[PDB]
Short mmCIF file of C-alpha atoms and ligand atoms in Angstrom, two decimals:
data_model
loop_
_atom_site.label_atom_id
_atom_site.label_comp_id
_atom_site.label_asym_id
_atom_site.label_seq_id
_atom_site.Cartn_x
_atom_site.Cartn_y
_atom_site.Cartn_z
CA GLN P 1 -22.84 -36.47 24.34
CA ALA P 2 -19.67 -34.47 25.01
CA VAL P 3 -18.09 -36.16 21.99
CA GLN P 4 -17.31 -32.87 20.24
CA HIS P 5 -13.53 -33.16 20.51
CA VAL P 6 -13.70 -36.20 18.19
CA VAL P 7 -16.14 -34.97 15.55
CA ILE P 8 -14.81 -34.54 12.01
CA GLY P 9 -16.31 -31.97 9.66
CA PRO P 10 -18.09 -33.81 6.83
CA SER P 11 -16.55 -31.38 4.32
CA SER P 12 -13.22 -32.42 5.78
CA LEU P 13 -13.53 -36.10 4.85
CA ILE P 14 -13.81 -37.94 1.51
CA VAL P 15 -15.16 -41.48 1.61
CA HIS P 16 -14.27 -43.49 -1.48
CA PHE P 17 -17.34 -45.79 -1.40
CA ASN P 18 -16.21 -47.45 -4.63
CA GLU P 19 -13.23 -48.93 -2.78
CA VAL P 20 -14.20 -51.42 -0.07
CA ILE P 21 -11.11 -52.46 1.90
CA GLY P 22 -12.89 -54.61 4.47
CA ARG P 23 -16.24 -56.02 5.47
CA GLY P 24 -17.28 -56.58 9.05
CA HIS P 25 -20.58 -57.80 10.40
CA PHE P 26 -21.44 -54.23 11.44
CA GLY P 27 -20.54 -52.71 8.07
CA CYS P 28 -17.95 -52.06 5.36
CA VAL P 29 -14.57 -50.34 5.54
CA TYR P 30 -13.65 -47.94 2.75
CA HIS P 31 -10.53 -46.14 1.67
CA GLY P 32 -11.00 -42.53 2.68
CA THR P 33 -9.23 -39.16 2.53
CA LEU P 34 -8.91 -36.90 5.60
CA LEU P 35 -7.88 -33.25 5.92
CA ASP P 36 -5.75 -33.08 9.08
CA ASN P 37 -5.26 -30.10 11.40
CA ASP P 38 -2.02 -29.03 9.67
CA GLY P 39 -4.09 -28.87 6.48
CA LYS P 40 -2.45 -31.90 4.92
CA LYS P 41 -4.37 -34.63 3.11
CA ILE P 42 -4.06 -38.01 4.80
CA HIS P 43 -5.18 -41.59 3.97
CA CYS P 44 -7.65 -43.13 6.33
CA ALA P 45 -9.97 -46.07 6.78
CA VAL P 46 -13.66 -45.32 7.20
CA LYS P 47 -15.95 -47.79 8.91
CA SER P 48 -19.71 -47.57 8.39
CA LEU P 49 -22.07 -48.91 11.05
CA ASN P 50 -25.21 -49.23 8.93
CA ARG P 51 -26.19 -52.68 10.25
CA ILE P 52 -26.74 -51.49 13.80
CA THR P 53 -30.21 -50.03 13.39
CA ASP P 54 -31.87 -49.20 16.71
CA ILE P 55 -29.30 -48.69 19.47
CA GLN P 56 -25.44 -45.84 20.44
CA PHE P 57 -24.35 -48.29 23.15
CA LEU P 58 -21.57 -49.21 20.74
CA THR P 59 -20.37 -45.62 21.02
CA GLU P 60 -19.37 -46.63 24.54
CA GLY P 61 -16.12 -47.59 22.84
CA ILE P 62 -15.45 -43.85 22.78
CA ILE P 63 -12.96 -44.44 25.58
CA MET P 64 -10.56 -45.44 22.81
CA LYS P 65 -9.97 -41.74 22.22
CA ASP P 66 -8.07 -41.68 25.52
CA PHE P 67 -5.81 -44.49 24.37
CA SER P 68 -2.40 -43.62 23.00
CA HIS P 69 0.43 -46.04 22.22
CA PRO P 70 2.41 -46.85 19.04
CA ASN P 71 1.13 -50.45 18.99
CA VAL P 72 -2.56 -49.78 19.64
CA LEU P 73 -4.90 -48.50 16.91
CA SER P 74 -5.87 -44.86 17.47
CA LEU P 75 -9.22 -43.28 16.63
CA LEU P 76 -8.94 -40.36 14.20
CA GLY P 77 -12.56 -39.36 14.78
CA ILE P 78 -16.22 -39.93 13.97
CA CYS P 79 -18.28 -38.32 11.22
CA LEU P 80 -22.03 -38.02 11.72
CA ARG P 81 -23.62 -36.47 8.61
CA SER P 82 -25.12 -44.14 9.25
CA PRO P 83 -22.47 -42.87 11.73
CA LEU P 84 -18.92 -43.27 10.40
CA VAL P 85 -15.69 -44.14 12.17
CA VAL P 86 -12.43 -42.72 10.86
CA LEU P 87 -9.27 -44.74 11.50
CA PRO P 88 -5.68 -44.72 10.24
CA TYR P 89 -4.94 -46.51 6.97
CA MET P 90 -3.02 -49.73 7.38
CA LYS P 91 -0.95 -50.33 4.24
CA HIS P 92 -0.43 -54.07 4.73
CA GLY P 93 -3.85 -55.09 6.12
CA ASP P 94 -4.13 -57.69 8.86
CA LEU P 95 -1.00 -59.36 10.19
CA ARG P 96 -2.24 -62.85 9.31
CA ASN P 97 -2.95 -62.07 5.65
CA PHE P 98 0.42 -60.34 5.35
CA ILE P 99 2.43 -63.33 6.60
CA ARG P 100 0.29 -65.82 4.65
CA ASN P 101 1.13 -64.12 1.36
CA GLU P 102 3.69 -66.23 -0.51
CA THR P 103 5.11 -63.17 -2.30
CA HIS P 104 6.26 -61.74 1.02
CA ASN P 105 9.52 -62.63 2.72
CA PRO P 106 9.37 -61.87 6.42
CA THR P 107 12.43 -63.28 8.13
CA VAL P 108 12.41 -65.31 11.31
CA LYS P 109 13.48 -62.11 13.07
CA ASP P 110 10.69 -59.99 11.54
CA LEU P 111 8.24 -62.59 12.79
CA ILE P 112 9.51 -62.33 16.37
CA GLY P 113 9.48 -58.54 16.24
CA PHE P 114 5.84 -58.52 15.14
CA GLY P 115 5.25 -60.68 18.19
CA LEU P 116 7.10 -58.24 20.48
CA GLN P 117 5.19 -55.26 19.04
CA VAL P 118 1.90 -56.96 19.92
CA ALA P 119 3.19 -57.76 23.38
CA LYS P 120 3.88 -54.07 23.88
CA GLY P 121 0.38 -53.02 22.77
CA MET P 122 -1.12 -55.62 25.09
CA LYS P 123 1.11 -54.41 27.92
CA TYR P 124 -0.30 -50.89 27.47
CA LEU P 125 -3.91 -52.16 27.27
CA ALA P 126 -3.47 -54.39 30.32
CA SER P 127 -2.26 -51.46 32.42
CA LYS P 128 -5.35 -49.45 31.49
CA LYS P 129 -7.27 -52.41 32.81
CA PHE P 130 -8.56 -53.06 29.29
CA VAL P 131 -9.29 -56.68 28.42
CA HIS P 132 -9.37 -57.29 24.62
CA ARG P 133 -11.24 -60.64 24.43
CA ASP P 134 -10.38 -61.39 20.77
CA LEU P 135 -6.57 -61.12 20.30
CA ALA P 136 -5.44 -63.00 17.18
CA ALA P 137 -3.18 -62.50 14.17
CA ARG P 138 -6.17 -61.55 11.98
CA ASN P 139 -7.02 -58.72 14.40
CA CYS P 140 -3.66 -56.95 14.32
CA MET P 141 -2.88 -54.47 11.57
CA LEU P 142 0.46 -53.57 9.92
CA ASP P 143 1.14 -50.04 8.64
CA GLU P 144 3.63 -48.75 6.03
CA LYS P 145 6.34 -48.33 8.67
CA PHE P 146 5.76 -52.05 9.40
CA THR P 147 4.37 -51.09 12.80
CA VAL P 148 1.81 -53.55 14.19
CA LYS P 149 -1.35 -52.08 15.71
CA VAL P 150 -3.57 -54.09 18.02
CA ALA P 151 -7.05 -53.52 16.56
CA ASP P 152 -10.60 -54.93 16.71
CA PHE P 153 -11.41 -53.09 19.92
CA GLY P 154 -13.55 -50.07 20.71
CA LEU P 155 -15.33 -48.56 17.73
CA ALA P 156 -13.33 -50.92 15.51
CA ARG P 157 -14.74 -54.05 17.20
CA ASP P 158 -16.37 -56.45 14.75
CA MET P 159 -15.97 -59.87 13.13
CA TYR P 160 -14.02 -59.59 9.89
CA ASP P 161 -13.72 -63.33 9.42
CA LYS P 162 -16.64 -65.35 10.82
CA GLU P 163 -14.97 -68.69 9.94
CA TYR P 164 -13.56 -69.09 13.47
CA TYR P 165 -16.45 -67.72 15.54
CA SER P 166 -19.33 -69.44 17.28
CA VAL P 167 -22.29 -67.30 18.26
CA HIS P 168 -23.52 -68.20 21.74
CA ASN P 169 -27.25 -67.93 20.93
CA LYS P 170 -28.24 -67.26 24.56
CA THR P 171 -26.10 -64.12 24.93
CA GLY P 172 -25.16 -63.56 21.29
CA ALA P 173 -21.52 -63.37 22.39
CA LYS P 174 -19.05 -64.10 19.63
CA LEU P 175 -16.58 -66.81 20.62
CA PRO P 176 -13.30 -67.50 18.76
CA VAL P 177 -13.08 -70.95 20.23
CA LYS P 178 -9.59 -71.97 19.09
CA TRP P 179 -8.02 -68.81 20.55
CA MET P 180 -9.91 -68.95 23.84
CA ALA P 181 -8.28 -69.78 27.18
CA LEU P 182 -9.45 -73.06 28.78
CA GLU P 183 -11.31 -71.34 31.61
CA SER P 184 -13.04 -69.15 28.99
CA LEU P 185 -14.46 -72.11 27.09
CA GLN P 186 -15.87 -73.39 30.38
CA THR P 187 -17.21 -70.20 31.97
CA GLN P 188 -17.48 -67.85 28.96
CA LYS P 189 -15.74 -64.95 30.73
CA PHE P 190 -12.53 -63.15 29.72
CA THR P 191 -9.58 -61.63 31.59
CA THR P 192 -6.10 -60.26 30.90
CA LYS P 193 -4.84 -63.78 31.65
CA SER P 194 -7.13 -65.15 28.96
CA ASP P 195 -5.73 -62.45 26.65
CA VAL P 196 -2.31 -63.92 27.51
CA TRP P 197 -3.43 -67.41 26.44
CA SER P 198 -4.64 -65.93 23.11
CA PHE P 199 -1.41 -64.00 22.69
CA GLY P 200 0.39 -67.34 22.86
CA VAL P 201 -1.75 -68.63 19.96
CA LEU P 202 -0.99 -65.40 18.08
CA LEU P 203 2.76 -66.10 18.53
CA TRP P 204 2.31 -69.59 17.20
CA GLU P 205 0.44 -68.10 14.21
CA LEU P 206 3.43 -65.85 13.51
CA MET P 207 6.08 -68.59 13.61
CA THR P 208 4.00 -70.84 11.28
CA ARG P 209 3.29 -67.78 9.07
CA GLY P 210 -0.44 -68.07 9.71
CA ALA P 211 -1.22 -71.77 9.86
CA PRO P 212 -4.65 -72.65 11.30
CA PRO P 213 -4.42 -73.76 14.94
CA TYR P 214 -5.40 -77.35 15.82
CA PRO P 215 -6.32 -78.29 12.23
CA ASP P 216 -7.16 -81.88 13.23
CA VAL P 217 -9.21 -81.12 16.30
CA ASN P 218 -12.86 -80.31 15.75
CA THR P 219 -14.43 -77.39 17.62
CA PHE P 220 -16.36 -79.60 20.06
CA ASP P 221 -13.36 -81.73 21.17
CA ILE P 222 -11.05 -78.74 21.79
CA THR P 223 -11.94 -78.68 25.47
CA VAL P 224 -11.03 -82.25 26.45
CA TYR P 225 -8.03 -81.78 24.17
CA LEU P 226 -6.86 -78.95 26.42
CA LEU P 227 -7.97 -80.73 29.60
CA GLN P 228 -5.66 -83.63 28.75
CA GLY P 229 -2.74 -81.19 28.56
CA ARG P 230 -2.25 -81.38 24.79
CA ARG P 231 -1.13 -78.05 23.30
CA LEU P 232 -0.01 -76.63 19.95
CA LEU P 233 3.27 -78.22 18.79
CA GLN P 234 6.48 -76.29 18.13
CA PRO P 235 6.71 -74.90 14.58
CA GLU P 236 9.69 -76.10 12.49
CA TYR P 237 11.36 -72.70 12.64
CA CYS P 238 10.38 -71.41 16.08
CA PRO P 239 13.46 -70.99 18.25
CA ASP P 240 13.29 -73.19 21.35
CA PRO P 241 13.14 -70.30 23.85
CA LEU P 242 10.17 -68.69 22.06
CA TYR P 243 8.15 -71.93 22.08
CA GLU P 244 8.90 -72.02 25.77
CA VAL P 245 7.24 -68.63 26.05
CA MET P 246 4.14 -69.98 24.23
CA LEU P 247 3.79 -72.88 26.66
CA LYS P 248 3.76 -70.47 29.62
CA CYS P 249 0.84 -68.63 28.04
CA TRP P 250 -1.25 -71.82 28.04
CA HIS P 251 -0.80 -72.94 31.63
CA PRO P 252 -4.13 -74.32 32.96
CA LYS P 253 -3.83 -71.97 35.92
CA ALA P 254 -4.47 -68.39 34.83
CA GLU P 255 -2.51 -66.84 37.71
CA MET P 256 0.43 -69.03 36.72
CA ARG P 257 0.65 -67.35 33.28
CA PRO P 258 3.12 -64.51 32.73
CA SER P 259 1.98 -60.91 32.67
CA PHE P 260 2.23 -58.95 29.42
CA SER P 261 5.05 -57.07 31.12
CA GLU P 262 7.01 -60.29 31.63
CA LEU P 263 6.23 -61.21 28.01
CA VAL P 264 7.75 -57.90 26.91
CA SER P 265 11.01 -58.66 28.78
CA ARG P 266 11.36 -62.24 27.54
CA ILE P 267 10.55 -61.60 23.86
CA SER P 268 12.73 -58.50 23.75
CA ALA P 269 15.67 -60.48 25.15
CA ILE P 270 15.06 -63.20 22.53
CA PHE P 271 14.75 -60.58 19.78
CA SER P 272 18.26 -59.32 20.62
CA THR P 273 20.09 -62.60 21.25
CA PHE P 274 21.28 -64.95 18.41
C1 0J3 L 1 -6.05 -54.28 -0.03
N1 0J3 L 1 -5.56 -53.87 1.23
C2 0J3 L 1 -5.90 -54.59 2.49
C3 0J3 L 1 -6.83 -53.82 3.37
N2 0J3 L 1 -6.49 -52.49 3.41
C4 0J3 L 1 -6.85 -51.96 4.75
C5 0J3 L 1 -6.13 -50.82 5.23
N3 0J3 L 1 -6.40 -50.31 6.42
C6 0J3 L 1 -7.35 -50.84 7.22
C7 0J3 L 1 -7.58 -50.24 8.48
C8 0J3 L 1 -8.54 -50.75 9.34
C9 0J3 L 1 -8.76 -50.10 10.71
F1 0J3 L 1 -7.98 -49.05 10.86
F2 0J3 L 1 -10.01 -49.79 10.92
F3 0J3 L 1 -8.37 -51.02 11.62
C10 0J3 L 1 -9.32 -51.90 8.93
C11 0J3 L 1 -9.10 -52.48 7.71
N4 0J3 L 1 -9.89 -53.63 7.31
C12 0J3 L 1 -10.82 -54.24 8.24
C13 0J3 L 1 -10.12 -55.17 9.24
C14 0J3 L 1 -9.58 -56.39 8.80
C15 0J3 L 1 -8.93 -57.24 9.71
C16 0J3 L 1 -8.83 -56.85 11.07
C17 0J3 L 1 -9.37 -55.62 11.50
N5 0J3 L 1 -9.26 -55.26 12.88
O1 0J3 L 1 -9.95 -54.26 13.39
O2 0J3 L 1 -8.45 -55.95 13.62
C18 0J3 L 1 -10.01 -54.78 10.61
C19 0J3 L 1 -8.10 -51.95 6.82
C20 0J3 L 1 -7.83 -52.53 5.54
C21 0J3 L 1 -5.30 -52.03 2.89
C22 0J3 L 1 -5.14 -52.47 1.47
#
């Protein structure tokens, strides 16, 4: 109820409804224009929540206001007036689309840096005891300054690409099966260590420039596949030490996996060497 420090004046926001920039299960995302404190016009992304009809409990992602880090998506505010969420505009869309685009030329070193940037955002989130539960290349955003923001959390949580989700049907939980840690597929619960397993998959996505993981393994078999110790193979252009980092993320023992803080050290070292 004490949300007032996040409310945006409706006469201070223009939502360009004719320009859908995204569609999630909870509602569309539009290009918008925001009048900032300094009185300057700024681009923004506005997310409508029209699908959620009854209940409000979603707004218990309001804790995202307290989050602040260059690699985590900030909340600009909410506009009441279907409640609307106002978020920064991300020039290059989701990380995975950006790298999949053949008219783009990210270098091998760009690709590793995107990876490090995510590692830093996850480091920050881990320390605030925040578990993401759906880290993947399609859920990171890339701004004009080519800064990666970890997204799809808090008021921005949604499915923007249902292709890779299963819906549990008993709990309604949305499960991105090919990004999920082994223990998660078995117990259906998520921890920082399961975020670390997903981060590994994210890395692999980067080095393949957004190839689909385990293309020849069907969704059912994925579990025995992992139980047998099979893992994603090294991409043609992934430096040996980086692949080594991926393997650590997928150790069958969660406690055995590196922290996000260790991942920041290792990737940063790799980013500088060569
Ligand atoms: C044609 N273009 C691609 C999309 N465009 C944008 C630009 N900014 C966006 C900002 C957000 C937000 F800040 F809310 F995160 C969301 C967009 N699209 C929905 C979306 C797609 C993929 C992932 C996520 N996400 O929350 O991880 C969200 C956004 C889509 C830019 C121009």
